[PDB]
C-alpha cells in the first residue's frame, strides 16, 4: 500500500510571546517511509530543526516528529512543509497557535 501523511503542528508548551519554546511537526500514518519535512518561518526554511527516529504504529504506518527551538511572536508565522510520493505538490500546514 501507499498511505498519505497526516500532519499536525503544535508547540510543546502553551505559546507565550517572548518565552522560549519548542515547535513541532508530527507526521504520521504514511507509507512508505521516505518523507521530506521542512519547517518554515514566514516562508523561510528553518536551519537547525531536529527529528526523532522514524517509527511505526500498530497498523504498520510510519510516523516521525520534527522539532526546533524557538520564540513565538504575535506577528511571526510558522508552518510545516511536507513532501511524500502520495502527494502531487508539497503540503504546507500553518501553525495555529492553539491546535
Amino acid at each position: 500500500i501507499q498511505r498519505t501523511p497526516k500532519i499536525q503542528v503544535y508547540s510543546r508548551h502553551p505559546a507565550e510571546n517572548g518565552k522560549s519554546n519548542f515547535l513541532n511537526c508530527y507526521v504520521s500514518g504514511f507509507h512508505p517511509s521516505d518523507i521530506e519535512v521542512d519547517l518554515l518561518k514566514n516562508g523561510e526554511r528553518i536551519e537547525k530543526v531536529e527529528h526523532s527516529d522514524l517509527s511505526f504504529s500498530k497498523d504498520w504506518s510510519f510516523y516521525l516528529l520534527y522539532y526546533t527551538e524557538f520564540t513565538p511572536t504575535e506577528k511571526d508565522e510558522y508552518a510545516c512543509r511536507v513532501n511524500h510520493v502520495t502527494l502531487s505538490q508539497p503540503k504546507i500546514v500553518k501553525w495555529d497557535r492553539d491546535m
Partner: protein, 263 residues
C-alpha cells in the same frame, strides 16, 4: 507490559539513510535506538542513566545484528525489483500471571503477511512471499532457535530488569497544561479548541459541556513532544454568540480529579 521492538528494513534506501533500523519501546516510551550505519544499540531519554548489568547493551546489539542480516536476506528471496519494505513487531507482555506473552508479527510493503508460530518454531503466512522468506530464514539453521530464545527468554528477561531498575521512569506522571480558545470561522460560527500540553502517560480525555449538559468529545488530535511527553487537542464548531456557555473537562492520571476549564 510491554516491551516491543519495531524493526524496519528497506530494499533501496537513499544515501545517508540506513537500510535497517530498530526502536525498542517500554509502554509508550522509547528506550532503544539502533540502525545499520552505526551498527550499535544505544539507550534513549532517561534510559541513558538506567543502571544496567553492564553487558546489557552488548546483548541488545548482537541480537539486533542477527536480525539485521535476516532482514536484508529476506529481500534476496523475493522475486520482483519492488522496491520492498519489511517490518517486524517483536516483543513481549507480562501476563495475568508471571509468564510472558510473545508477540511476533511481520508486514511486507505495509500489509501484514507473516508471523512466528511459537508452538512449532516456524514463520508462517498465506503468501508466496511469506513462504519464501519463511523457508529462507528456516534454512539459516540457527535462526528459528534464536528467534524462539529471543521471545521466550531474552525479551521477557529484559523487560523485568527494566521494570525493576527503571520502574520510576515508567510510573512518571505529568499533568497537562490546559487552554481553551475560540476563533472566528464561518459567519455564524466559531471554533473552540481545548488543547493539552506536555502530559504523560498518553491516556487522556477531553470532553465539552454545552452548559453543564454533556456536549460530546469534539474532533480529537494527538501527538508526541521531543521529550517523550505528549500533546492533544480537540475542537468543536459552535455558533457565534453562545460560546461562553461551553467549557472543557480533562482527565488524566497526573490529576487528582477531572479538571474543568473555561475560556
Amino acid at each position: 507490559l510491554s516491551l516491543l521492538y519495531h524493526l524496519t528494513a528497506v530494499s533501496s534506501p537513499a544515501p545517508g539513510t540506513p537500510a535497517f533500523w530498530v526502536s525498542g519501546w517500554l509502554g509508550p516510551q522509547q528506550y532503544l535506538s539502533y540502525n545499520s550505519l552505526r551498527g550499535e544499540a544505544e539507550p534513549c531519554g532517561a534510559w541513558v542513566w538506567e543502571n544496567q548489568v553492564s553487558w546489557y547493551w552488548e546483548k541488545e546489539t548482537t541480537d539486533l545484528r542477527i536480525k539485521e542480516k535476516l532482514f536484508l536476506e529476506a529481500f534476496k528471496a523475493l522475486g520482483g525489483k519492488g522496491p520492498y519494505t519489511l517490518q517486524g513487531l517483536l516483543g513481549c507482555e507480562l501476563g495475568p500471571d508471571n509468564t510472558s506473552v510473545p508477540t511476533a508479527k511481520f508486514a511486507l510493503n505495509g500489509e501484514e503477511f507473516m508471523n512466528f508460530d511459537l508452538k512449532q518454531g516456524t514463520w508462517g503466512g498465506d503468501w508466496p512471499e511469506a513462504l519464501a522468506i519463511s523457508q529462507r530464514w528456516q534454512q539459516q539453521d540457527k535462526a528459528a532457535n534464536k528467534e524462539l530464545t529471543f521471545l521466550l527468554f531474552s525479551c521477557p528477561h529484559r523487560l523485568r530488569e527494566h521494570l525493576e531498575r527503571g520502574r520510576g521512569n515508567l510510573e512518571w506522571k505529568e499533568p497537562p497544561s490546559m487552554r481553551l480558545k475560540a476563533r472566528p470561522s464561518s459567519p455564524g460560527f466559531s471554533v473552540l479548541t481545548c488543547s493539552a500540553f506536555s502530559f504523560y502517560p498518553p491516556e487522556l480525555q477531553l470532553r465539552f459541556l454545552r452548559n453543564g449538559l454533556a456536549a460530546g468529545t469534539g474532533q480529537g488530535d494527538f501527538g508526541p513532544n521531543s521529550d517523550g511527553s505528549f500533546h492533544a487537542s480537540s475542537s468543536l464548531t459552535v455558533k457565534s454568540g453562545d460560546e461562553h456557555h461551553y467549557c472543557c473537562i480533562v482527565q488524566h492520571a497526573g490529576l487528582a480529579q477531572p479538571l474543568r476549564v473555561e475560556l
